[PDB]
Coordinates of C-alpha atoms and ligand atoms in Angstrom, one line a residue:
X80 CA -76.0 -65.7 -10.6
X81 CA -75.4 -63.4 -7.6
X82 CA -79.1 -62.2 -7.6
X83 CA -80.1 -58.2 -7.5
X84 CA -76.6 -56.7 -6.6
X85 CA -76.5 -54.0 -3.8
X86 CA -75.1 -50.7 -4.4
X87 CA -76.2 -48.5 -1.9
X88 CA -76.2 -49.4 2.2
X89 CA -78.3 -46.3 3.4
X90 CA -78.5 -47.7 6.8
X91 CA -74.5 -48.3 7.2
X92 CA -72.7 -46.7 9.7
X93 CA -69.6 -48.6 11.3
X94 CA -66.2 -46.9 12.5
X95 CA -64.5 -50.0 12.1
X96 CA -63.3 -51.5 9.0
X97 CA -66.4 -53.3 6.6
X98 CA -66.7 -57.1 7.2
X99 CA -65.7 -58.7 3.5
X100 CA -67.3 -62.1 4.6
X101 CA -71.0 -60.5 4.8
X102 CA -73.1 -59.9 2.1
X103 CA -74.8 -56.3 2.0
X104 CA -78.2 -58.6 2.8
X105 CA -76.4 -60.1 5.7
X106 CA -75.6 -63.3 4.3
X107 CA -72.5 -64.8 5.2
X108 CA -69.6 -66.0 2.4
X109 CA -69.2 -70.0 2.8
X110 CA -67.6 -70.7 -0.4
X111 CA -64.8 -69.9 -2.4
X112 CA -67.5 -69.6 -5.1
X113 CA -69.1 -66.8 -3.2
X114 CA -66.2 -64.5 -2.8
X115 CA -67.0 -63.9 -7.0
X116 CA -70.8 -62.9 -5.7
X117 CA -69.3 -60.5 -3.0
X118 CA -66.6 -59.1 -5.3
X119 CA -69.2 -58.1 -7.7
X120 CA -70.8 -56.8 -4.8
X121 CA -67.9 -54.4 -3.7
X122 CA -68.0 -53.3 -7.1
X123 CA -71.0 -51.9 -7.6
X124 CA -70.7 -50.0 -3.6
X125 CA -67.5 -48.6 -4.7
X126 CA -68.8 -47.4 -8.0
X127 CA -71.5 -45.7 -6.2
X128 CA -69.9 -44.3 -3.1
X129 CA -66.3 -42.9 -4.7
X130 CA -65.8 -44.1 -8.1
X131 CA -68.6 -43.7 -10.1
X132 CA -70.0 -45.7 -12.8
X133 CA -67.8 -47.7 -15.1
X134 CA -68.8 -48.1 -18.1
X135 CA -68.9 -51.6 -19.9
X136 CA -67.0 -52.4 -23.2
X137 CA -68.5 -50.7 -25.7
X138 CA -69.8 -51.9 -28.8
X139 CA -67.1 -50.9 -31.1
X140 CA -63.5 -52.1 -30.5
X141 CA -61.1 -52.3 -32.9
X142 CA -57.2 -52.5 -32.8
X143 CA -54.7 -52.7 -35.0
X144 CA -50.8 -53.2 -34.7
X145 CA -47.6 -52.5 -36.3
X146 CA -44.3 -52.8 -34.6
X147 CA -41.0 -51.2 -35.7
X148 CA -37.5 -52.1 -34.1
X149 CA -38.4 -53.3 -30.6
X150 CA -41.5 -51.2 -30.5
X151 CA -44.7 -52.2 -31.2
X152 CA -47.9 -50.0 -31.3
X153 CA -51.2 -50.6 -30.8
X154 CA -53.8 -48.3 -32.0
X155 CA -57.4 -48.9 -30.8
X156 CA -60.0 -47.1 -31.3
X157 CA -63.4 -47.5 -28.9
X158 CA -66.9 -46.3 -29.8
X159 CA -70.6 -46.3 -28.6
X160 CA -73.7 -47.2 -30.2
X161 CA -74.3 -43.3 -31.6
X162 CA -71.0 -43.8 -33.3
X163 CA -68.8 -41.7 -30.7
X164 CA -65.7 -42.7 -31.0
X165 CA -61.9 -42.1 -29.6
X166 CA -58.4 -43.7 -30.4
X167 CA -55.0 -43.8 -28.4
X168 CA -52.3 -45.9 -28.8
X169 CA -50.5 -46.9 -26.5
X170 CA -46.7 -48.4 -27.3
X171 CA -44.9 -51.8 -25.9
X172 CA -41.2 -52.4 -25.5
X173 CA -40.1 -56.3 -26.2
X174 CA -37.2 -58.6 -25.2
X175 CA -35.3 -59.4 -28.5
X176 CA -35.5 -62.4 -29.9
X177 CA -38.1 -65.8 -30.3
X178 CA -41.1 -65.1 -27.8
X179 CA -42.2 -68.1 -25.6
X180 CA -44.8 -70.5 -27.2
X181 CA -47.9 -68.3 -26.0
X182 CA -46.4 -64.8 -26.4
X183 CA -44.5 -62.8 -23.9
X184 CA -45.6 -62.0 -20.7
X185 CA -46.9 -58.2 -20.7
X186 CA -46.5 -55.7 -17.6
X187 CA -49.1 -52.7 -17.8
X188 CA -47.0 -49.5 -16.2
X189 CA -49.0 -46.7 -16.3
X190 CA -47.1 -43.5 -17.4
X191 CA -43.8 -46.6 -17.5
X192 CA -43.9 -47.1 -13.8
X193 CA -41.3 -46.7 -11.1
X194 CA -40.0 -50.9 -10.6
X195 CA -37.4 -52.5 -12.5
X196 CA -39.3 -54.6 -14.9
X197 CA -37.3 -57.7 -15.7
X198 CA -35.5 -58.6 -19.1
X199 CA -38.3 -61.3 -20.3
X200 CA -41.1 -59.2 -19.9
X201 CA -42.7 -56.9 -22.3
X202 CA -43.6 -53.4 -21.3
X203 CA -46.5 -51.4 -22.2
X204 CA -46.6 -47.7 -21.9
X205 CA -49.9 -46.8 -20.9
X206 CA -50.2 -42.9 -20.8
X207 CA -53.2 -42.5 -18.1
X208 CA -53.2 -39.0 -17.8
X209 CA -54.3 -38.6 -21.7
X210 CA -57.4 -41.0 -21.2
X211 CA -58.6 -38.9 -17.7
X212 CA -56.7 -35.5 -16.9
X213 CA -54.9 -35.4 -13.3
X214 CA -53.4 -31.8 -12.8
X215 CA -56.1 -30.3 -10.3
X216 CA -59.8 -30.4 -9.2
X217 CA -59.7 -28.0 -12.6
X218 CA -59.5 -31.3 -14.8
X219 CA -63.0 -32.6 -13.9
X220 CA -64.2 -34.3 -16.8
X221 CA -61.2 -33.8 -19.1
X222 CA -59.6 -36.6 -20.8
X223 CA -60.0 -39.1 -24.0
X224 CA -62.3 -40.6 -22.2
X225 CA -65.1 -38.4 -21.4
X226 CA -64.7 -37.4 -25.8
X227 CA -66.6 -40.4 -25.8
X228 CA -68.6 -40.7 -22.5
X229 CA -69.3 -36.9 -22.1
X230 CA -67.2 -34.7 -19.5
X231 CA -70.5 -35.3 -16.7
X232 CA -69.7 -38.8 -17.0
X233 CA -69.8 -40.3 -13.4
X234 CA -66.4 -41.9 -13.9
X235 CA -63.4 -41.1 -12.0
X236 CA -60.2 -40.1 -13.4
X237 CA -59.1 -43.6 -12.0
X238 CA -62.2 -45.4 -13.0
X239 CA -61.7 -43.9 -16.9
X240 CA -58.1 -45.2 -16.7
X241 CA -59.4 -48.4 -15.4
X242 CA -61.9 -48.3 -18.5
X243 CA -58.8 -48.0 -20.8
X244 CA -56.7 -50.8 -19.2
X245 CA -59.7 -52.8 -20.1
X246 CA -59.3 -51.6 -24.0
X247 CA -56.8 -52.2 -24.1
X248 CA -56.5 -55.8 -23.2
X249 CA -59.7 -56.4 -25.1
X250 CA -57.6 -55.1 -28.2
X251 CA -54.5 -57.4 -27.0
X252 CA -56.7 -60.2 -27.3
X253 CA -57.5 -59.1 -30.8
X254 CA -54.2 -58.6 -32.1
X255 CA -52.5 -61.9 -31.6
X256 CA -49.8 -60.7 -33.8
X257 CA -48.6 -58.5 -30.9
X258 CA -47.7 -61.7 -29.0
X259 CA -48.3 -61.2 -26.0
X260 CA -49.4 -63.9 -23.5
X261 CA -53.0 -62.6 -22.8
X262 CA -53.1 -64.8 -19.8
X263 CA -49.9 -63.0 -18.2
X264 CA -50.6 -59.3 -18.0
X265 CA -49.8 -57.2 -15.1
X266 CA -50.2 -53.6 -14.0
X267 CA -48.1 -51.2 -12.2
X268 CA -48.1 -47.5 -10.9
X269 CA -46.2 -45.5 -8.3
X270 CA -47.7 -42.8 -6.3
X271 CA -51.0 -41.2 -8.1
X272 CA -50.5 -43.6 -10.9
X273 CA -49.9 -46.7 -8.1
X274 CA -53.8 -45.6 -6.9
X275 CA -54.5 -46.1 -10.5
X276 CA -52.9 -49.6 -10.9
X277 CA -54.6 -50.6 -7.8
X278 CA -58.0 -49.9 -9.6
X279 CA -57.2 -51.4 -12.6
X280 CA -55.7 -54.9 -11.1
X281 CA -59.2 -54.8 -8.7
X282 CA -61.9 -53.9 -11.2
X283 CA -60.1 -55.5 -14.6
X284 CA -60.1 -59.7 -13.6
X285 CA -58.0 -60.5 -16.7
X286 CA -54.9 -58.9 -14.8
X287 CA -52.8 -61.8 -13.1
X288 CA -50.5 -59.6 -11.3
X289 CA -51.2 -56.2 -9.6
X290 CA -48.1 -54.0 -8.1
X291 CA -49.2 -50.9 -6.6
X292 CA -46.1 -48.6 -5.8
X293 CA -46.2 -46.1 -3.0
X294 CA -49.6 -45.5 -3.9
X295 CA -50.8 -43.8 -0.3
X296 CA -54.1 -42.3 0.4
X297 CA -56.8 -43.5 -2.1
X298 CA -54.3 -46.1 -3.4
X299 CA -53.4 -49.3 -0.5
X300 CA -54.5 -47.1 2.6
X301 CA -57.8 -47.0 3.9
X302 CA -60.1 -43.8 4.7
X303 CA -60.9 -45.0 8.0
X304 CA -57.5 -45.5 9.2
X305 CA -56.0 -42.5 7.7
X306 CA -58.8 -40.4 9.4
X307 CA -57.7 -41.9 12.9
X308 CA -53.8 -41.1 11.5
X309 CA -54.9 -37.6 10.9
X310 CA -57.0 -36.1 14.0
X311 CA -53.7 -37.9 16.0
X312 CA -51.2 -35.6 14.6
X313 CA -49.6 -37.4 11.7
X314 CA -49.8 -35.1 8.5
X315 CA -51.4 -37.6 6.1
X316 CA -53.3 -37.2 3.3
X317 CA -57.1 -38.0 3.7
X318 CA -60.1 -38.3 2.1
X319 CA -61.3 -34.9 3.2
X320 CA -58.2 -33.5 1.3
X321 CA -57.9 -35.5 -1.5
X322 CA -61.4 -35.0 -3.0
X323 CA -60.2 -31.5 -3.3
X324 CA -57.0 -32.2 -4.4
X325 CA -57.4 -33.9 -7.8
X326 CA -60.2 -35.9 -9.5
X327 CA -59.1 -39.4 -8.4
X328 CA -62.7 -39.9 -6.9
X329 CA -65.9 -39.2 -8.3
X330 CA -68.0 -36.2 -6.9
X331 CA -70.2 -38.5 -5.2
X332 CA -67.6 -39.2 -2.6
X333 CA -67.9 -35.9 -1.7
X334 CA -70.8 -36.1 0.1
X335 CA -69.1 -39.2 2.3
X336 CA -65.6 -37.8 2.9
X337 CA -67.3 -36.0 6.2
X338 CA -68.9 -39.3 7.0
X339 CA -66.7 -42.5 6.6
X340 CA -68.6 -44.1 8.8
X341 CA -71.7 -44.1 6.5
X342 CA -69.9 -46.1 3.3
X343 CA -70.0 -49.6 3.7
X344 CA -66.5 -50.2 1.7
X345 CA -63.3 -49.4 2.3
X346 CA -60.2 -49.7 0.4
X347 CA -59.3 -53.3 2.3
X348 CA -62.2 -54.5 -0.1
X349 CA -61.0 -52.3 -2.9
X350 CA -57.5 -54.6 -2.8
X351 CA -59.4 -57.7 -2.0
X352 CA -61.3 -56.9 -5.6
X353 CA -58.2 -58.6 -7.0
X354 CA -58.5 -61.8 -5.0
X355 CA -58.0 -64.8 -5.8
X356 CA -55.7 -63.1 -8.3
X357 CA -52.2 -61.7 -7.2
X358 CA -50.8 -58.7 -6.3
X359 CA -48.0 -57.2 -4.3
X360 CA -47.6 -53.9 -2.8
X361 CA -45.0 -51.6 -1.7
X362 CA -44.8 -48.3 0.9
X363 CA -42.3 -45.9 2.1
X364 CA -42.5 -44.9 5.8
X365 CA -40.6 -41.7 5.3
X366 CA -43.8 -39.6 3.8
X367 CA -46.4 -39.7 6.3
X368 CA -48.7 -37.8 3.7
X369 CA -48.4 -41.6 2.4
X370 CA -50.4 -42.9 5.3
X371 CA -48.1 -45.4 6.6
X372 CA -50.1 -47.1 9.5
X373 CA -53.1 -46.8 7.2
X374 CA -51.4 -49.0 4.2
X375 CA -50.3 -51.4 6.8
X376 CA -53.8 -52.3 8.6
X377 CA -56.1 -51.9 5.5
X378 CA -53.5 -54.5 4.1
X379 CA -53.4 -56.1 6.8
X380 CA -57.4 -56.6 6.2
X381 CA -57.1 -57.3 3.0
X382 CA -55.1 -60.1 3.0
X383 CA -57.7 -62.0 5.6
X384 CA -59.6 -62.9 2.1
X385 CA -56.7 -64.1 0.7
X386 CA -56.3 -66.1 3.9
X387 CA -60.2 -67.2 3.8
X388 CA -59.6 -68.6 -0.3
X389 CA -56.4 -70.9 0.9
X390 CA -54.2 -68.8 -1.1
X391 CA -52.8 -66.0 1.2
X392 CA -48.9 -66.5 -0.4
X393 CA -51.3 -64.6 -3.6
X394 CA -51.2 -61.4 -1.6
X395 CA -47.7 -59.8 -0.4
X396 CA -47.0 -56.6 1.2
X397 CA -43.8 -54.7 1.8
X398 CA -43.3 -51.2 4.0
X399 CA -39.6 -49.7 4.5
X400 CA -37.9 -46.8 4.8
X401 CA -34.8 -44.9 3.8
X402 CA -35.1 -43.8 -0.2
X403 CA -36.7 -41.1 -2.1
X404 CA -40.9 -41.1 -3.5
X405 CA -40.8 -43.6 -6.2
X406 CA -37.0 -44.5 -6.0
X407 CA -36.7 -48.0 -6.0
X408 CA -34.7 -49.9 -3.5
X409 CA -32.7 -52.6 -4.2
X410 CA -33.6 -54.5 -1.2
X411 CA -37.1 -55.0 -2.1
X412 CA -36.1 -56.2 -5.9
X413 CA -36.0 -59.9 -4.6
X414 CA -39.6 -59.9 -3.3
X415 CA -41.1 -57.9 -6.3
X416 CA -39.2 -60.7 -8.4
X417 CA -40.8 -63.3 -6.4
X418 CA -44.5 -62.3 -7.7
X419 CA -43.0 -61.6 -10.9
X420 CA -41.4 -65.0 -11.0
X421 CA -44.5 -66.6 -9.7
X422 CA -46.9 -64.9 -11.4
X423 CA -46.0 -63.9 -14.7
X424 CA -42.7 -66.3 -15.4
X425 CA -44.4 -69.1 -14.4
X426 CA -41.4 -69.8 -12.2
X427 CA -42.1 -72.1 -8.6
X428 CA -41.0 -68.9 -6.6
X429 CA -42.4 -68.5 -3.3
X430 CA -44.3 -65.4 -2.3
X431 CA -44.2 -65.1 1.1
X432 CA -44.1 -61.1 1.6
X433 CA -45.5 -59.4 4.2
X434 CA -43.4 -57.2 6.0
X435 CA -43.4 -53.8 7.3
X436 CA -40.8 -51.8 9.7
X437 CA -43.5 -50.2 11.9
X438 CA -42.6 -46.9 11.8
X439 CA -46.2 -45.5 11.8
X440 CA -45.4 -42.1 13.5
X441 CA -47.9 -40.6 16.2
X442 CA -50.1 -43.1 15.7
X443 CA -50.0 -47.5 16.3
X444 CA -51.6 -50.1 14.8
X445 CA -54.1 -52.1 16.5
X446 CA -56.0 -55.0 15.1
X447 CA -58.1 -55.3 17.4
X448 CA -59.7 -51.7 16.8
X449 CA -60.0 -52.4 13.6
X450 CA -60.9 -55.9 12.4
X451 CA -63.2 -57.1 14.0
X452 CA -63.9 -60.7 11.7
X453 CA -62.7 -64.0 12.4
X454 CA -61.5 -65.6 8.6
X455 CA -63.7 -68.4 7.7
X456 CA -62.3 -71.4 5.7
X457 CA -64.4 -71.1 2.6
X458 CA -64.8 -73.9 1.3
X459 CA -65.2 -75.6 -2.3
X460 CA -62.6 -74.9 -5.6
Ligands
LIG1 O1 -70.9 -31.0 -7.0 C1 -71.1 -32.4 -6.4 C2 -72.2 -33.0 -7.2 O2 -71.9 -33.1 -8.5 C3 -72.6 -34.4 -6.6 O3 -73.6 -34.9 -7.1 C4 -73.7 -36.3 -6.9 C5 -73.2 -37.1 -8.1 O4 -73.5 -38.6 -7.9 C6 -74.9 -38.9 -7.7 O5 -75.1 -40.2 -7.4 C7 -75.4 -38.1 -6.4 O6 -76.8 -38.3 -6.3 C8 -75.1 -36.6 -6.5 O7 -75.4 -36.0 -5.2 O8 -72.8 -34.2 -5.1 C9 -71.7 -33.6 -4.4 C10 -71.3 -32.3 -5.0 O9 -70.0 -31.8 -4.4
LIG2 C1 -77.6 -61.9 -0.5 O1 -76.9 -61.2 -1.5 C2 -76.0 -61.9 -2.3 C3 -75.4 -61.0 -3.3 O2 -76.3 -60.3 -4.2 C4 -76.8 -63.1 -3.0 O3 -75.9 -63.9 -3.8 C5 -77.5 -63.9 -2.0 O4 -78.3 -64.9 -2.6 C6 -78.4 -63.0 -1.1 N1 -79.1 -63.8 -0.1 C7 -80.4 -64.2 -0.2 C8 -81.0 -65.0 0.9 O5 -81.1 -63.9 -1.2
LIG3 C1 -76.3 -48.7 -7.4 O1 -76.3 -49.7 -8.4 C2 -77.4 -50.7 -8.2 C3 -77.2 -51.7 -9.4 O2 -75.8 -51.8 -9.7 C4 -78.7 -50.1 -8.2 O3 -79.7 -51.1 -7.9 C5 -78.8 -49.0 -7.1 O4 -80.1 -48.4 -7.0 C6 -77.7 -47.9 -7.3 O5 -78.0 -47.2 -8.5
LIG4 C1 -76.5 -45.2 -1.0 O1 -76.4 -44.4 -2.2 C2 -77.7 -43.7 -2.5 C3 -77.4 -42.9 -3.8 O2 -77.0 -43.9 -4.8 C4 -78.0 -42.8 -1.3 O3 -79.2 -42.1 -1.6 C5 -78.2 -43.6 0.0 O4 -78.5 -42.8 1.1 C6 -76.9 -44.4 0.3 O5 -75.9 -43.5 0.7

């Protein structure tokens, strides 16, 4: 449908933030239609430049369930063609009672999460760090995941998780007896496991609601901005740090951390991945390792697709101040509700959320240094 996909620019080389309404091939975006052609498109350049490759489902899934109190757990077990296999099974907390006529709603929280989840939503515990190890740049390759893949596997830790998420909706939509509405799954994370959730609700389409948490650099911030943050004198993490940090990114991205310029993506198209799903996403000003102004403009981009597909209330933001990394503030709880609400309740809850408190630091946000697009009106359903 989209033709011979791109995923390598080798002529690219723009400071500025990536134009989402252009086609690698130079082709503009006209349709709504077309923004499924680009996203597929932004896939394949963020697999190749800092992701690596993930892998499609594999031919053996299976899943079974069994649920005792409150507690259900599902135990899948995923394997390749040469009979590799791996199992993990991950647990889900339920309301009490009679579930709605399709199942309950279902929120993703990798490692639990950090937000309040409310009382008619299930909860699935989704423990990332066993399918792709996080402690250092000494867990390259570690995980469940690369037992079945192999520990050279291109993937990411936070393409493997992604690779999970997907198991294990595939396995929810096995397992009807675990009642969950399969239509009204989200995902959430806070800090490294909010760079996760962002992954999963771009790269994984049946998620209807993604909710990043203080996510920072490599989660809601872009590289390009956070470079500019960093030679001004804010102490922010950056992709020249972070590749050495952990294994969030593949080792491909080494070789571009040096040379943003040169990778024709940014994480403004990594968020737009989830369009014209939803998804909301939350900062905290008082880390500057968090890449405040960075978050806010790469957002900020972001949201112009939501804007170009008519449905920019699909997208919120929120930045503050004033609490601990990963406490959650009780002034944000009514906007997080509001995409809940809207999103996963089914509620007519407006979504209007995009707000920050500007406290970027040493450094300002200018648009007009950074996006340099008009947003076109695509047009069509
Ligand atoms: O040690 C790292 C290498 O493993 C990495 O190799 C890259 C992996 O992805 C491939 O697409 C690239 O061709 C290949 O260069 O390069 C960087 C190095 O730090
Ligand atoms: C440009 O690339 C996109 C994405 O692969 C494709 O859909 C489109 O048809 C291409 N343009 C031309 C003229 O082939
Ligand atoms: C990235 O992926 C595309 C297909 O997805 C290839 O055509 C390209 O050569 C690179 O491997
Ligand atoms: C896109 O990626 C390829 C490797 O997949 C590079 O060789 C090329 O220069 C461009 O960076």
């Amino acid at each position: 449908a989209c033709g011979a996909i791109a995923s390598t620019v080798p002529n690219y080389n723009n400071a500025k933030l990536p134009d989402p309404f252009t086609f690698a091939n130079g082709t503009a975006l006209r349709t709504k239609a077309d923004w499924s052609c680009r996203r597929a498109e932004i896939s394949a350049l963020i697999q190749n430049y800092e992701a690596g490759t993930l892998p499609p489902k594999p031919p053996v899934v299976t899943a079974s369930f069994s649920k005792s109190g409150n507690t259900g757990t599902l135990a899948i077990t995923a394997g390749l063609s040469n009979s590799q296999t791996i199992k993990f099974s991950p647990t889900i907390s339920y309301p009490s009672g009679t579930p709605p006529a399709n199942g309950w709603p279902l929120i993703i929280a990798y490692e639990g999460g950090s937000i309040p989840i409310p009382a008619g939503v299930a909860t699935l515990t989704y423990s990332n760090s066993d399918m792709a190890q996080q402690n250092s740049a000494s867990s390259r390759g570690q995980g469940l995941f690369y037992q079945l893949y192999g520990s050279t596997h291109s993937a990411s830790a936070m393409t493997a998780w992604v690779w999970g998420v997907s198991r294990i909706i595939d396995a929810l939509e096995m397992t009807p007896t675990a009642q969950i509405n399969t239509q009204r799954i989200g995902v959430t994370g806070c800090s490294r496991d909010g760079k996760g959730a962002l992954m999963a609700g771009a790269f994984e389409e049946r998620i209807a609601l993604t909710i990043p948490q203080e996510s920072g650099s490599g989660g809601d911030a872009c590289w390009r901005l956070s470079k500019y943050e960093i030679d001004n004198g804010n102490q922010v993490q950056d992709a020249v740090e972070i590749v050495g940090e952990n294994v969030w990114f593949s080792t491909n991205f080494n070789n571009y951390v040096q040379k943003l310029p040169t990778v024709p993506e940014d994480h403004h198209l990594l968020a737009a991945m989830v369009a014209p799903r939803a998804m909301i996403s939350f900062e905290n000003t008082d880390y500057l390792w968090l890449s405040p102004m960075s978050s806010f403009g790469c957002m900020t981009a972001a949201h112009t697709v939501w804007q170009g597909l008519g449905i920019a209330d699909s997208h919120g933001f929120a930045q503050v101040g004033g609490h601990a990394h990963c406490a959650w503030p009780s002034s944000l709880t009514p906007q997080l509700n509001a995409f809940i609400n809207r999103f996963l309740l089914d509620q007519s809850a407006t979504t209007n959320v995009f707000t920050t408190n500007n406290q970027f630091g040493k450094v300002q946000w200018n648009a007009a240094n950074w996006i340099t697009w008009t947003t076109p009106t695509l047009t069509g359903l």
